[PDB]
Structures are given as C-alpha cells and as structure tokens.
C-alpha cells in the first residue's frame, strides 16, 4: 500500500513559518491530491489545503493567505508552510492522500484521505526552556506531587523509581496563563502503608537536565 | 458559506457488545454534480492518525471490520457499530467531500465504554511550604476513580464561592476498572491565601446523594 512519512519543527515561537514536508513510498505520485490537514482540540480537524502533481494548490480561505504548499515531483515530496504563526496554530498536522485529481478517478475509485502521515506535533509559544518546579501534595489514603512552571513538553514522572506503578493518575499538563506547563501526578496506597513505606516521585525535564526526587511525606 | 457538518452525540457510552450509532447532518446536499454523494468516517485512536472506516456514504474500506456500517442520503447519514468490541474506543469523525474548499468535519463523536456509577472518592490537599516561598500557592482537589465522566467541582475558601482561579484536567478512561479521575488546581496570589483560613472543594457527582466536601485550615 501507498505510505506517507512526515517530518519537520513543531516547536516554533509566533511570527515563524512552519515547515513541514511529506514523503511518498508504495505507490504513484500522480492520480490525486496531497493533501494538509490539522487537528487541535478546540477546533477539531481542520483541512488545510491541497496540490496536484502539476503544481496547483487549493486553499481553506479561512487560512489561504498564510499557507504555500509546494510539490517536488524529483523527490516524491510535497511541504506546508504556514506563515506568521501564533498559539492558535497549535495543533497535529497530518499529510494525507485525497481526492482522484480527475473527474473520472474522483467518481469511480476509492481514493480520499484514505492514507494518513504519523502526524508532527506542532506548538507555538513564546516561551524559553524552563525545568519545573515540584511540589508534594501530602496526606485509603491519597498521596501525589505537583509538577510546576516548564516548558516544553513533557517531563516524565515515576513513583519510587518505577517500583510503584499502581493505583498511579498523572493527569494531562496544562497550559498556564504565563505560558508554562503543568500537572499532577498523585496514587492511592493503603492508609497503613504510611508508617512502613516511603513515596518518592521521580521526575524527569530532560531540556533543561533538570531531575528532581521528592519525597512525599505527612 | 462552508459546508456544516454536525455529529450527535458528542459523547457516546456504549456497553460492549451492544449496537451503536452516530449522526451526522450536513447543512448543505452532499449530492455531488458527478451523481455520487461524498461522505466518509473516520475512527481515530488515541495517539494515532484518522482511519476511514467508510466512504462514500456505505462504501466500507478493506481491512475494516464489518460491524462497522454506513448509510443514509442527502443531508442525512448514519455511521452504525452492530456490536462495540474494547478495540472501537476512541473518536469518530464524518467528512464531507462534496463542497470545497474547504473540505470539512465533524465535530467528533467520543465513543467510551459505560460501566455502573462511581462515586469519586475525594482528596484535598494544602499548598506546600516549599511553594509559598515562590510567592504563589496551589490547592489540590483530586477526584478520584469516579464514572461517569460528568463533575463538578467549586471551590470555598472561608466559605466564599471562586470563580475562574482553577483548572481542570481528566485522566483518560482507566483500562481495567474504566473510571476517570480529575484534578482541580486553585491558583493564589498567596496574599490571598494566608488572607483566608479554611479551604475546601465541594464535590457533585451522580454517585453522590449529595455533594461531598474535604477541608482544612492554616
């Protein structure tokens, strides 16, 4: 089967160009559009645009005077760039295979963004590399930490180096006001657990080598 | 004027093995000039591309389980699941691929597995004294392994109602007991923090008679 495989910057800071390009193996280049096409979750799939083999591009008008998609026929490519971003722009952006570029494989065969890239994470933010600041949340019993103020994306959180693994919810980070990650990560252990056991959560902001175990105690 | 596509529900709780069916309407025909109507469905996975499921209103793609099922006409169309099996979680999209551009979505419908309701079982928990040095400070509230989906949580602080100082996140659906868990995150000033004495979240779900509340002071 044809196959696409993505690559490009997903960190940008506002006013930069998004580039991303698109790579085609298993199958023909000519015969349909490639196609962009964007998924947050505020405004869920967004199709972006599309170019056929000879060059010729169809834009979502909502976003056409930011968008230049480009089509390199010697290389089986085609790129996206999307010009003077803001946080709005965050999102998932997927090359996908559309439409029979004719009237008559459009009407009689399959194809239609029947094939999708892996997809390229894409976050927009003024933000510098920031390691987080971690903080216990103490006491069935509930216990947890904290995990305040990075960027970017992710830092990874263990309990007890990995030897505690149940009744374990890291919650999704969320973006603050200022531009900065955050989440909680917290178990539920045995209330007797608390005299005999100790917790520590490990976490992990490898951008900024930061690396922090802390203990969570009453 | 872009083509609306609306899905309904948004949220879709299914008991495994039982039928399921998502709507989607479109505010304009989808009855193409070429006689066919352009229609698919996507199943999407979390942390994985859209797959279709299904163009061409009914047209069902190879390799696609033949629970899954299209129909309809016109405005109005149908995506049907005979018997849900674990593997159908995730999100569903219907696209249009009549008007454009742009080409355009649904909203997504959520398909979750519904189980019996769970009370959240509550936890509070203080700012830490490593915090308040930053001069900021962060009240916890965890909701823990509660279904369904469906909270509400309001903050008091010296018996005040606060509005708009908190954040929410959910834990995706557990895999094994299929229960969710939620944070809320009191954002102060710390000013206003030591300003005030008593804390506490008061939390309403379903598999409360009437709401339940965790507290403390300093």
């Known amino acids: 089967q044809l196959q696409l495989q993505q690559w490009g910057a997903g960190l940008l800071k506002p006013s930069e160009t998004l580039s991303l390009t698109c790579a085609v193996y298993?199958?023909?280049?000519?015969?349909?559009?490639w196609t962009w096409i964007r998924q947050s979750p505020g405004k869920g799939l967004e199709w972006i645009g599309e170019?056929?083999?000879?060059?010729?591009?169809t834009y979502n008008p909502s976003l056409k005077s930011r968008v230049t998609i480009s089509v390199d026929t010697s290389k089986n490519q085609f790129s996206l760039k999307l010009n003077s971003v803001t946080a709005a722009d965050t999102a998932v952006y997927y090359c996908?295979?559309?439409?029979?570029?004719?009237?008559?494989?459009?009407?009689?065969?399959?194809?239609?963004?029947?094939?999708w890239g892996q997809g390229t994470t894409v976050t927009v933010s003024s933000a510098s590399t920031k390691g987080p600041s971690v903080f216990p949340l103490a006491p069935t019993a509930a216990l947890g930490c904290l995990v305040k103020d990075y960027f970017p994306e992710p830092v990874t959180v263990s309990w007890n180096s990995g030897a505690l693994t149940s009744g374990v919810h890291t919650f999704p980070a969320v973006l603050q006001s200022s531009g900065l990650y955050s989440l909680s990560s917290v178990v539920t252990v045995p209330s007797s657990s608390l005299g005999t056991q100790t917790y520590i959560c490990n976490v992990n902001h490898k951008p900024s080598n930061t690396k922090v175990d802390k203990r969570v105690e009453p | 004027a872009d083509v609306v596509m609306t899905q309904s529900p948004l949220s879709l709780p299914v008991t495994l093995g039982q039928p399921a069916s998502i709507s989607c309407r479109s505010s304009?025909?989808?009855?193409?000039?070429?006689?066919?109507?352009?229609l698919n469905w996507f199943q999407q996975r979390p942390g994985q591309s859209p797959r279709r499921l299904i163009y061409?209103?009914?047209d069902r793609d190879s390799g696609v389980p033949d629970r899954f099922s299209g129909s309809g006409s016109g405005t109005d169309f149908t995506l049907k699941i005979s018997r849900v099996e674990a593997e159908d979680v995730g999100l569903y999209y219907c696209?249009?691929?009549?008007?454009?551009?742009?080409?355009?979505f649904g909203q997504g419908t959520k398909v979750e597995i519904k189980r019996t309701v769970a009370a959240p079982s509550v936890f509070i928990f203080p700012p830490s004294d490593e915090q308040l040095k930053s001069g900021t400070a962060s009240v916890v509230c965890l909701l823990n392994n509660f279904y369904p989906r469906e909270a509400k949580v309001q903050w008091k602080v010296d018996n005040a109602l606060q509005s708009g100082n908190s954040q929410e996140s959910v834990t995706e659906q557990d895999s094994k007991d299929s229960t969710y868990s939620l944070s809320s995150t009191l954002t102060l000033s710390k000013a206003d923090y030591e300003k005030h004495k008593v804390y506490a979240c008061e939390v309403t779900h379903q598999g409360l008679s009437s709401p339940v509340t965790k507290s403390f002071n300093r």
């Open positions: 996908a295979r559309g439409y029979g570029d004719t009237p008559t494989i459009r009407r009689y065969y399959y194809y239609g963004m029947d094939v």
């Open positions: 298993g199958g023909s280049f000519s015969g349909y559009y």
């Open positions: 170019i056929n083999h000879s060059g010729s591009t």
């Open positions: 304009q025909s989808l009855v193409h000039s070429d006689g066919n109507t352009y």
């Open positions: 061409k209103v009914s």
């Open positions: 696209m249009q691929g009549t008007h454009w551009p742009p080409y355009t």
